[PDB]
Design a protein around this motif. Structure first.
Motif, PDB file in Angstrom:
ATOM      1  N   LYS A 142      -1.044   1.150  -7.621  1.00 20.98           N
ATOM      2  CA  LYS A 142      -2.157   1.834  -6.768  1.00 20.98           C
ATOM      3  C   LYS A 142      -1.251   2.389  -5.508  1.00 20.98           C
ATOM      4  O   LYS A 142      -2.178   2.889  -4.754  1.00 20.98           O
ATOM      5  CB  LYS A 142      -3.226   1.097  -6.792  1.00 20.98           C
ATOM      6  CG  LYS A 142      -4.044   0.864  -7.980  1.00 20.98           C
ATOM      7  CD  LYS A 142      -5.451   0.549  -7.804  1.00 20.98           C
ATOM      8  CE  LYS A 142      -6.113   0.115  -9.023  1.00 20.98           C
ATOM      9  NZ  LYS A 142      -6.072   1.268 -10.088  1.00 20.98           N
ATOM     10  N   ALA A 143      -0.013   1.916  -5.149  1.00 19.33           N
ATOM     11  CA  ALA A 143       0.477   2.241  -3.778  1.00 19.33           C
ATOM     12  C   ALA A 143       0.839   3.493  -3.969  1.00 19.33           C
ATOM     13  O   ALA A 143       1.146   4.359  -4.822  1.00 19.33           O
ATOM     14  CB  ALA A 143       1.797   1.425  -3.481  1.00 19.33           C
ATOM     15  N   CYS A 144       0.731   4.255  -2.702  1.00 22.01           N
ATOM     16  CA  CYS A 144       1.580   5.453  -2.475  1.00 22.01           C
ATOM     17  C   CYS A 144       2.997   5.320  -2.459  1.00 22.01           C
ATOM     18  O   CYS A 144       3.598   4.368  -1.738  1.00 22.01           O
ATOM     19  CB  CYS A 144       1.029   6.052  -1.342  1.00 22.01           C
ATOM     20  SG  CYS A 144      -0.666   6.571  -1.206  1.00 22.01           S
ATOM     21  N   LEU A 184      -4.414   6.581   5.438  1.00 22.99           N
ATOM     22  CA  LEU A 184      -4.913   5.699   4.352  1.00 22.99           C
ATOM     23  C   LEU A 184      -5.910   4.712   5.263  1.00 22.99           C
ATOM     24  O   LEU A 184      -6.785   4.171   4.484  1.00 22.99           O
ATOM     25  CB  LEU A 184      -3.781   4.869   3.837  1.00 22.99           C
ATOM     26  CG  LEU A 184      -2.789   5.439   2.748  1.00 22.99           C
ATOM     27  CD1 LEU A 184      -2.006   4.401   2.390  1.00 22.99           C
ATOM     28  CD2 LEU A 184      -3.697   5.975   1.581  1.00 22.99           C
ATOM     29  N   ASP A 241       0.688  -0.914   0.017  1.00 25.55           N
ATOM     30  CA  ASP A 241      -0.061   0.078  -0.034  1.00 25.55           C
ATOM     31  C   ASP A 241       1.017   1.055  -0.018  1.00 25.55           C
ATOM     32  O   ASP A 241       0.349   2.345  -0.749  1.00 25.55           O
ATOM     33  CB  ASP A 241      -0.894  -0.103   1.230  1.00 25.55           C
ATOM     34  CG  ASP A 241      -1.718  -1.149   1.295  1.00 25.55           C
ATOM     35  OD1 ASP A 241      -2.819  -1.145   0.535  1.00 25.55           O
ATOM     36  OD2 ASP A 241      -1.443  -2.057   2.191  1.00 25.55           O
ATOM     37  N   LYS A 300      -0.326  10.304  -5.458  1.00 22.51           N
ATOM     38  CA  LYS A 300       0.212   9.204  -4.802  1.00 22.51           C
ATOM     39  C   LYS A 300       1.685   9.163  -4.772  1.00 22.51           C
ATOM     40  O   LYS A 300       2.239   8.276  -4.275  1.00 22.51           O
ATOM     41  CB  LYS A 300      -0.536   7.855  -5.338  1.00 22.51           C
ATOM     42  CG  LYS A 300      -1.921   7.692  -5.077  1.00 22.51           C
ATOM     43  CD  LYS A 300      -2.401   6.492  -5.627  1.00 22.51           C
ATOM     44  CE  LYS A 300      -3.792   5.933  -5.200  1.00 22.51           C
ATOM     45  NZ  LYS A 300      -4.350   4.694  -5.909  1.00 22.51           N
TER      46      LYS A 300
HETATM   47 AG   LIG Z   1      -2.190   4.791  -1.787  1.00 21.21          AG
END
Ligand SMILES: [Ag+]
Length: 300
Positions: free
Chosen positions: A100-102, A231, A71, A131
């Motif tokens: 899709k991760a930060c 998050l 994530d 992100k």
């Molecule tokens: Ag994220």
């Protein structure tokens, strides 16, 4: 909630991983990656600490197993000549495994490596400006220390907003916005210049035998924990970070950010600036723009 640390065998990565292992919320997961074969042993080492955070380590050329389901990805691996290729290679693996991760870029020069990261993710068609973060928290906590030292305040109770970029004259602490504190303009000038050159204090005191690894680890850990909280649905989480915003001053620019479940929730205004801050802001936009273009042209 899983946090991956790319570059976890270096001094910054290990201090970051030690702080994350003990401070991440219960039920979190931590994955460490680096080229060095010691990285699995760093995780085993940390796994002996009795916190409810699962940790595993990976080595070699392939970061995929550490990135699966991540994530948040923090990149502390790796001046431009050496780190540009390292950043591109790692961001490419991020773009294939957890797009899709930060992504928090710690690798310096942040002003440029964030631009490299953005263009790499663009080529993979997964670039999300909400992100991608340049981690500038080290300038913030240094400012907090220096202001509290000068004003006799508790360092934990001082919070200085810092805008712009992460190197030299691009670092602009908004001392005029520190509540309950007032400075003379000579105090502003000497304090601003110390913040912008704080790194040199460390390397000189290290006799040239190193740089700021532990405090940068603490800085990255603070930004990482703020991200995880936001998050997970926590409200009111505000941190300054180097992000692609509206481009009013530069394509990438560090400003107070309200964080949310998607990363950036709102890019807050930098607020009212003093004459000194407005001057220093406009006076560094060109060197910031050249830092960005340096990163863009390396990928394009
Ligand atoms: Ag994220």
């Amino acid at each position: 909630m899983k946090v991956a640390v790319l570059g976890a065998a270096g001094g910054i990565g290990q201090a970051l991983a030690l702080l994350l292992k003990t401070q991440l919320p219960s039920g979190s997961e931590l994955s460490l990656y680096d080229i060095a074969p010691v990285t699995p042993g760093v995780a085993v080492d940390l796994s002996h600490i009795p916190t409810a955070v699962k940790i595993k380590g990976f080595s070699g050329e392939d970061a995929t197993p550490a990135l699966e389901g991540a994530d948040v990805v923090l990149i502390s691996a790796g001046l431009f000549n050496v780190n540009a290729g390292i950043v591109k290679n790692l961001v490419q693996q991020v773009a294939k495994t957890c797009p899709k991760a930060c992504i928090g870029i710690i690798t310096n020069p942040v002003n440029t490596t964030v631009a490299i990261a953005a263009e790499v993710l663009k080529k993979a068609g997964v670039y999300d400006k909400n992100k991608l973060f340049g981690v500038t928290t080290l300038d913030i906590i240094r400012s907090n220390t220096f202001v509290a030292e000068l004003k006799g305040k508790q360092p934990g109770e001082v919070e200085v907003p810092v805008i712009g970029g992460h190197s030299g004259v691009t670092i602009l602490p908004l001392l005029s916005q520190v509540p309950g504190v007032s400075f003379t303009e000579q105090e502003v000038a000497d304090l601003t210049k110390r913040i912008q050159n704080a790194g040199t204090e460390v390397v000189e005191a290290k006799a040239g035998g190193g740089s700021a690894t532990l405090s940068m680890g603490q800085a990255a850990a603070r930004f990482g924990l703020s991200l995880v909280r936001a998050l997970q649905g926590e409200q009111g989480v505000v941190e300054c970070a180097y992000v692609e915003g509206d481009g009013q001053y530069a394509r990438f620019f560090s400003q107070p950010l309200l964080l949310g479940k998607n990363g950036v929730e709102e890019r807050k205004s930098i607020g009212t600036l003093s004459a000194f801050e407005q001057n220093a802001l406009e006076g560094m936009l060109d060197t910031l723009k050249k830092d960005i273009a340096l990163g863009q042209e390396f990928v394009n």
